[PDB]
Amino acid sequence: PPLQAVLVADSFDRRFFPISKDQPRVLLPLANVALIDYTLEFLTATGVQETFVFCCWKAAQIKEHLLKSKWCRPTSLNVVRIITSELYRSLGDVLRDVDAKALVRSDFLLVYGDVISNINITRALEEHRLRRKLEKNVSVMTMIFKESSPSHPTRCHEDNVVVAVDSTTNRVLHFQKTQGLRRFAFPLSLFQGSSDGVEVRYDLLDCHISICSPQVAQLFTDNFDYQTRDDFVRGLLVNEEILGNQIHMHVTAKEYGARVSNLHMYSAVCADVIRRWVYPLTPEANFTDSTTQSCTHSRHNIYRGPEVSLGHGSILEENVLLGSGTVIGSNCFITNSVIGPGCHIGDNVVLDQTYLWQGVRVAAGAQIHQSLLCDNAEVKERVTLKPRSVLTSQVVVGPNITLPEGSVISLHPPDAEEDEDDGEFSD
Amino acid sequence: DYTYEELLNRVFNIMR
Amino acid sequence: MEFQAVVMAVGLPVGNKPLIWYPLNLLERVGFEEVIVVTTRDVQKALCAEFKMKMKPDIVCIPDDADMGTADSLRYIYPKLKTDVLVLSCDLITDVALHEVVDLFRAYDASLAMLMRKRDFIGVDSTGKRLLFMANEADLDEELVIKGSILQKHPRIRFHTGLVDAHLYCLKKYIVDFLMENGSITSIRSELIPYLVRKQFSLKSLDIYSFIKEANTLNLAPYDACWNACRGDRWEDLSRSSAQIVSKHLVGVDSLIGPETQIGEKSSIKRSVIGSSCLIKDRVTITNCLLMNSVTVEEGSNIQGSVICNNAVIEKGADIKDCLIGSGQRIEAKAKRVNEVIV
Amino acid sequence: ATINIGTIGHVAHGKSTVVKAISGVHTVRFKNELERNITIKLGYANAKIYKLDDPSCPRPECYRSCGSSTPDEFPTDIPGTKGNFKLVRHVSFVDCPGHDILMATMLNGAAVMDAALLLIAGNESCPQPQTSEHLAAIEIMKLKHILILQNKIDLVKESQAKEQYEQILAFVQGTVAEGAPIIPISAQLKYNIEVVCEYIVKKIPVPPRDFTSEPRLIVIRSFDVNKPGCEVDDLKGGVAGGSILKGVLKVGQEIEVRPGIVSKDSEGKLMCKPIFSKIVSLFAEHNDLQYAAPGGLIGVGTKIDPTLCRADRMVGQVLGAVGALPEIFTELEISYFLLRRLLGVRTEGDKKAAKVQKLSKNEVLMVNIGSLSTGGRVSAVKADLGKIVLTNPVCTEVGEKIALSRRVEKHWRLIGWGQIR
Amino acid sequence: DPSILDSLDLNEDEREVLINNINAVKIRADIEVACYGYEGIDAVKEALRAGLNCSTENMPIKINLIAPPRYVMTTTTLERTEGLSVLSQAMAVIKEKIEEKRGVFNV
């Protein structure tokens, strides 16, 4: 049978506020490319071809950009249906909705908005198939996950995962997050279930590439009380007395799938995809034939779009996706950056770890750090910033003005810790 | 003796 | 040397084979001249002469008091313990080549060790050497509490409810001392070891080094279990029935018997072991069970799965079924029922 | 110290008052925490109650007498009279609250209970919290005098101020608790906590007690909990404030210590070793009057090397007497009864209290021989006859009582009766 | 002579620091020992006292009983090894007067 993949392009961890004001979450430029693109290239890599995307909040801009998709070409292998429904705000309803129109034939692979991945599901896909039809629907879900180590910057302060699993069929036994739990709690339910070895793990990522089966749309319709996948899995893990038909977990070893959630996660995944950690996917492969993403990979992980006019003596040690249209002056010391298109720079500037974007601009001698910007975001002479110091929506900063850490300024007083300005204070 | 019934019949209304 | 085969054994090496003596025997096979063997002095001296009844030129006998818990008797014998001890429990009947556990110990400077053949769910490491948790359902009701620290350091844990440990603990002198000041810690197996593992986390830290086993075990309340042992025992008796007045006509099926024993006519034995120097010589049959001596046997013992210990008798009309022979059986005919009965 | 008291009562109302409301002296020891629900040890509270011919008896306090079972007011009678309120001596009025976590003491020191000044709450449901197991320890506690005082009289409603009080004064008769009246007191309504020095200390008054009988002291408790790294001068005898079984603490008493250390080749029967435990230490709760008598509950001080029993080792044992009879012979005759009222938990369907059984070998069996609970691998057991034996001399002048609680589970029960050899 | 050592005294700090400046050291020989009564035990204590008195005569300093269970003689190293003599008479109680009601010394 074909391999169809439900997909929702509004991850309800609505954290990229105020950034979510101008352009929606999913459309975000990570490395001058749509995350949703990364996801779609993934879907094509594992070879699925009938993908059902979904966006409720701000579906307009989604279609606006995705009409010219790498997979919205007539030659594409993937067919897409942006069902522009603005009723649900929890995945529960969209899963009962793919129930409500019998879209998924059978054996689908649901996926959140902006998973960064290179994973070949086919190994999983087939073992799922095996223990689902050589076992006749005793499965409902076969979670896929990716081995890691806790200390990595993939698991930010916010989100980790810890899970009890079996070791014979690798079936899930319990799933739970660990936002500040110096201890944990596992019931002997585990062992009164079976006396042949049980495993606990804290070294799987929040891969969020759940394989599933339309009877998951069943398990969501039959009980209208689930609003997220974790709701699903813990409800089914407690409802094992009857009609559980538990999850058959499975971990990979060689790939990299992360459901980017928070600005720290975006940070980590961007400055790991520049390091080719996911390759095939990296903008010098220009996987979206979209023109201006011609990225002339070069010495020592320095990427370089065409026509960057890099400034004299501007050292750039590593991992600098200088996008198209850029221009740079003398001594501009960039590092780990992502300089999008339309980025004029001054002199003596340092931009360690920064993430500029399109439209951005900056004058001379303007040290920055750990930063982030957005469309026409501007900071003039001798400004300075600090970790997570977002600033978007064309915000400006005046000369001489240092700024503190969380300086998330934007086009709104009430939500940003500043407002659209051309100084520092005074909205 | 003479005090148990006294308490019982003198605190019936006030003490709930 | 660096050890002492101190044996925490209380309470007899029954059968056709000196069972209780066998932990000694086996450690004796691999060096370990010294064997501290605590005895039973809750009434009288009923255990030491029983060791004078044995054949190891280097054994030692230790009297005791009313009640001696494991760590209690540890603290008791503590002074004469002047090395890294090697404690050991009563019913070691297990062909484990002990070189593996002391191997692991001598390797990773282990503050402890133990064994586990295949209550008491445990968490063992990925590599299966540095265990990380032990408990039982008695300890706590249901919640497998594991302090997030260790999962934040030791990444992947396998579990084990399918275990039969053998209470064998290679130690280190300073842990014996750490116990000697801990007057309240009564028993090693129940409280000490889990306390130490609890204190594994707040290289000069401590260690715990378990081991999975699939060869043999430690006997408990069902001693008919070690009939398994009996069936297997003769293999242990390769160079370390076997010698008796045999009949070669009566049923011999995985049997065991000592010399100068019940040799008569018209008997049988099916898949079990026997006693030594008792009265079983009349018209008899198998009992698929084991017996101790001094139990006069006669008239076709149609029994199955029981014990005929001392203080028993039967003659000329006897028949039984899974009814153990305890004390107070001056019997000659008592048709028994296979349910729980010890007459 | 000539006659003491005890207590018994239902639960599930809060006995932070039925433990130390008008007991005279408070209740606290090494990690005691006087009343979370109730206390379990039966001890001695030093106080001397006496009347002055006014509607209540002046407590050992020379000004008044009141209780702590009401936060703003409690209707009560007259207090009595001041003027350095008189008394006789340390006529103990001890109390045993509604907890049963000291069955060793509740079977050793129980039989030294002369009276029983108690309380009975009225916040009970259909199943009985303290009227299903808490009457399975002091059944033979020798306290013919008893007053199970109802408590809920004004605060609990009509269907709780009289809910189970009578349904226990008729159906808590397995022990001597139902045959006790309800003298005016309260732990849930505070009914004249002053009048509990006359209408209680004279309704279950100090019974005519033994005045010069044998010094048969069976020590029920010992007092030493000090921290290691011993202090300056803690080398003395006992120091034990509690209820001793018998004993005329007269001029020049002694203790024919039969049980003591292990006898000569102590798988034997008898011994001979008197270690004089001088009788000079018994303050009579108001004055230095130590011409005491057997029956009360006071603070005694022994004269021996404390090492052996300064700690909790002088409960179950005894301090000898004149007439060196005491039966130091474990292998004697004794008997017990089975379960009719389910101890530990109960039911209303005859499900946890119907069946009964006996002991055997290859197992363990704890029975409360006299005061001490011991045993193990029993030979057998008859219908209502027992060839009782043990591993040590539990030396008392007789051999009563048993324990229907071996090593079973997290807790224990009690179903037995009393038989003396 | 401390005040002749801090002879130059300007402030109280002078004498205080200069004195407390110059200045674990014991042998806590402890053994739980007593007889099984009041009379034999009083005799055991009297005999241990007489032994400690003949000790202080022989002068290993401070034969004490500052612990109730164990008569912990603070045997000072009077000759830097006096811990051999402070006991020389103490354990003699074992046959002097402590043998009335089984007073046996500990370790």
Side-chain angles (χ1 to χ4, degrees), chain A, chain C residues 1-240 243 252 258-259 264 275 300 305 312 317-318 326 328 333 335, chain D residues 1 6 9 12 14 21 24 43 45 47 55 58 60 67 71 75 79-80 83 97-98 104 109-111 115-116 121-122 127 129 136-137 161 170 174 177 179-181 184 187 205 207-208 215 228-229 237-238 240-242 247 252 259-260 268 274 284 292-296 299 301 306 311 316 320-321 323-324 326 344 349 353-354 370 375-376 380 383 386 393 399 403 416 418, chain E residues 2 24 29 34 37 40 43 47 50-51 60 67-69 83 90 92 103:
Chain A
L3 265 294
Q4 64 287 51
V6 193
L7 160 64
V8 172
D10 191 90
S11 74
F12 304 124
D13 192 307
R14 311 219 183 149
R15 167 154 300 99
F16 291 138
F17 282 76
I19 302 168
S20 41
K21 253 66 194 172
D22 319 333
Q23 74 273 20
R25 167 165 213 281
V26 165
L27 167 70
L28 261 181
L30 177 138
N32 298 324
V33 294
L35 279 303
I36 185 56
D37 289 340
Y38 283 145
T39 77
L40 285 160
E41 191 95 26
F42 157 81
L43 296 151
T44 308
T46 194
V48 296
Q49 72 288 26
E50 284 99 15
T51 176
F52 304 164
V53 76
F54 282 117
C55 171
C56 76
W57 179 54
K58 278 172 169 275
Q61 184 145 11
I62 292 298
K63 214 173 256 185
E64 284 174 357
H65 170 67
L66 269 294
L67 60 93
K68 64 195 55 56
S69 152
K70 198 271 168 193
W71 315 265
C72 207
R73 304 166 203 136
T75 177
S76 89
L77 281 304
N78 297 332
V79 302
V80 306
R81 304 90 189 284
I82 302 172
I83 317 300
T84 308
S85 163
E86 306 81 351
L87 275 68
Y88 41 77
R89 286 90 183 86
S90 295
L91 284 96
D93 291 330
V94 309
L95 182 39
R96 298 186 285 288
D97 202 342
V98 188
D99 178 77
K101 297 171 184 190
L103 313 167
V104 50
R105 300 175 178 99
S106 167
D107 210 350
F108 78 116
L109 318 173
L110 65 93
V111 166
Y112 281 95
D114 294 316
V115 290
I116 293 325
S117 158
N118 46 13
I119 302 172
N120 222 25
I121 312 174
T122 311
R123 311 311 160 106
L125 184 67
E126 290 295 328
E127 68 190 334
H128 161 98
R129 161 168 298 176
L130 182 136
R131 63 183 163 276
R132 185 169 190 272
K133 66 95 174 180
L134 190 66
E135 195 36 51
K136 279 78 174 176
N137 192 19
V138 174
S139 174
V140 63
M141 194 154 161
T142 72
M143 192 56 82
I144 198 167
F145 271 153
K146 181 268 300 174
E147 164 178 321
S148 164
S149 159
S151 315
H152 186 273
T154 176
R155 287 177 211 195
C156 65
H157 271 151
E158 198 170 354
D159 202 0
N160 311 330
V161 168
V162 60
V163 159
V165 59
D166 197 314
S167 180
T168 177
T169 187
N170 317 308
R171 61 191 290 275
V172 164
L173 284 176
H174 216 288
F175 168 95
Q176 36 204 349
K177 301 190 265 294
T178 180
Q179 292 77 16
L181 272 70
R182 285 266 157 71
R183 303 155 177 264
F184 294 110
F186 322 128
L188 188 138
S189 57
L190 277 65
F191 300 103
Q192 60 101 33
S194 68
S195 172
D196 45 357
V198 174
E199 189 172 323
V200 306
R201 296 188 212 172
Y202 187 53
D203 317 304
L204 283 60
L205 202 50
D206 61 328
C207 174
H208 283 300
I209 300 293
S210 167
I211 297 173
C212 283
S213 277
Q215 315 193 23
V216 169
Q218 256 184 344
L219 267 293
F220 264 60
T221 38
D222 301 298
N223 304 115
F224 298 97
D225 55 356
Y226 317 100
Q227 270 59 41
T228 40
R229 176 185 92 183
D230 294 25
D231 300 332
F232 185 20
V233 290
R234 263 185 220 144
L236 199 148
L237 278 164
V238 61
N239 195 34
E240 292 287 344
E241 54 279 28
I242 49 184
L243 316 182
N245 303 331
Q246 86 292 346
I247 319 302
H248 300 69
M249 208 278 300
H250 200 266
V251 64
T252 186
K254 294 182 280 180
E255 301 315 308
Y256 184 86
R259 209 296 308 279
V260 58
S261 89
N262 54 57
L263 278 167
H264 174 290
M265 287 287 278
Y266 161 72
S267 83
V269 169
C270 167
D272 283 335
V273 75
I274 284 302
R275 287 179 203 164
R276 314 179 70 97
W277 267 103
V278 304
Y279 182 66
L281 312 187
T282 170
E284 83 279 18
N286 201 351
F287 41 86
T288 73
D289 80 335
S290 62
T291 65
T292 187
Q293 295 302 321
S294 53
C295 311
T296 81
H297 159 89
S298 308
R299 184 74 219 166
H300 184 26
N301 298 286
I302 294 182
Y303 294 14
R304 182 192 258 206
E307 314 97 16
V308 304
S309 177
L310 189 44
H312 169 275
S314 45
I315 308 100
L316 282 74
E317 44 256 18
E318 65 177 358
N319 294 268
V320 46
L321 202 167
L322 283 164
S324 278
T326 66
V327 54
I328 275 170
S330 311
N331 316 108
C332 317
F333 183 80
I334 311 103
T335 302
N336 283 263
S337 154
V338 173
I339 296 313
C343 312
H344 290 56
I345 321 292
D347 306 287
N348 307 58
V349 298
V350 308
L351 282 85
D352 296 334
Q353 188 50 262
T354 187
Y355 303 27
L356 269 61
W357 270 336
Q358 48 208 8
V360 306
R361 197 188 211 156
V362 53
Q367 294 76 13
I368 314 189
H369 271 79
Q370 273 83 3
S371 160
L372 198 151
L373 276 76
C374 191
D375 50 346
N376 303 51
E378 199 291 322
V379 301
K380 286 189 76 65
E381 179 49 77
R382 64 183 68 88
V383 301
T384 319
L385 284 85
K386 291 167 201 299
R388 214 197 281 198
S389 63
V390 187
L391 58 90
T392 84
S393 313
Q394 310 166 356
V395 288
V396 182
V397 170
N400 318 300
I401 294 167
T402 320
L403 278 81
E405 183 269 344
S407 313
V408 53
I409 78 191
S410 287
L411 79 167
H412 282 298
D415 171 74
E417 279 211 16
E418 207 257 327
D419 177 40
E420 209 64 28
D421 59 346
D422 294 76
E424 168 182 19
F425 281 160
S426 47
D427 70 354
Chain C
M1 283 203 175
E2 53 179 24
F3 285 119
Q4 275 173 354
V6 176
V7 175
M8 180 72 214
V10 288
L12 270 297
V14 304
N16 312 113
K17 211 63 59 64
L19 299 196
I20 290 178
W21 189 28
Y22 274 160
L24 273 75
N25 185 1
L26 307 172
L27 272 300
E28 290 285 355
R29 302 171 305 102
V30 189
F32 267 107
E33 296 318 286
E34 198 294 312
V35 293
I36 277 181
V37 192
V38 292
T39 76
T40 180
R41 306 301 165 247
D42 48 349
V43 177
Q44 286 294 117
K45 295 287 159 290
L47 220 60
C48 303
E50 295 68 358
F51 310 138
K52 191 42 66 198
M53 198 66 159
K54 299 191 292 187
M55 285 291 291
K56 191 56 180 61
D58 195 339
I59 78 182
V60 176
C61 49
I62 318 294
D64 56 304
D65 190 356
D67 172 73
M68 292 218 170
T70 80
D72 165 83
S73 157
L74 271 175
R75 289 203 228 88
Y76 187 68
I77 313 293
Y78 162 80
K80 42 194 63 178
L81 301 175
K82 194 42 83 161
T83 183
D84 286 330
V85 302
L86 195 150
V87 79
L88 179 49
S89 158
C90 301
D91 291 12
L92 186 156
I93 313 99
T94 299
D95 44 353
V96 170
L98 269 298
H99 82 250
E100 207 57 25
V101 58
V102 58
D103 182 335
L104 181 62
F105 158 79
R106 292 175 293 178
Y108 308 134
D109 262 346
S111 48
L112 190 138
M114 63 180 291
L115 269 77
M116 272 155 173
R117 201 251 178 279
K118 297 186 298 195
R119 269 91 65 187
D120 198 2
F121 36 84
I122 75 172
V124 80
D125 190 283
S126 295
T127 185
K129 295 311 190 74
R130 302 188 97 255
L131 78 89
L132 317 173
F133 198 97
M134 282 163 305
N136 53 33
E137 90 298 352
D139 280 317
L140 53 87
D141 48 351
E142 200 80 2
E143 297 85 6
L144 269 294
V145 169
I146 279 168
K147 47 190 189 298
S149 65
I150 80 167
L151 271 188
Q152 285 146 355
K153 168 61 185 305
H154 271 256
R156 198 277 284 271
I157 308 186
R158 163 159 201 75
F159 275 61
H160 290 301
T161 48
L163 79 164
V164 288
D165 43 356
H167 195 289
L168 180 150
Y169 313 111
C170 179
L171 263 292
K172 290 298 280 190
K173 179 67 180 171
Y174 68 95
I175 299 298
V176 175
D177 306 1
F178 203 107
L179 164 65
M180 189 274 286
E181 60 89 16
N182 285 312
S184 70
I185 302 314
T186 66
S187 316
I188 177 159
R189 200 264 301 191
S190 45
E191 286 163 352
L192 174 69
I193 317 155
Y195 158 74
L196 195 61
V197 175
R198 257 173 304 167
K199 282 315 279 200
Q200 197 186 342
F201 308 97
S202 43
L203 216 57
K204 304 184 58 142
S205 43
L206 66 157
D207 297 327
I208 311 101
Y209 269 107
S210 163
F211 202 85
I212 297 91
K213 191 54 63 176
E214 314 88 14
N216 257 301
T217 175
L218 192 139
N219 193 349
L220 279 85
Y223 308 102
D224 46 352
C226 81
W227 292 358
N228 181 314
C230 310
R231 307 251 174 110
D233 275 344
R234 315 220 289 258
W235 284 245
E236 280 81 11
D237 295 330
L238 71 164
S239 199
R240 55 98 186 169

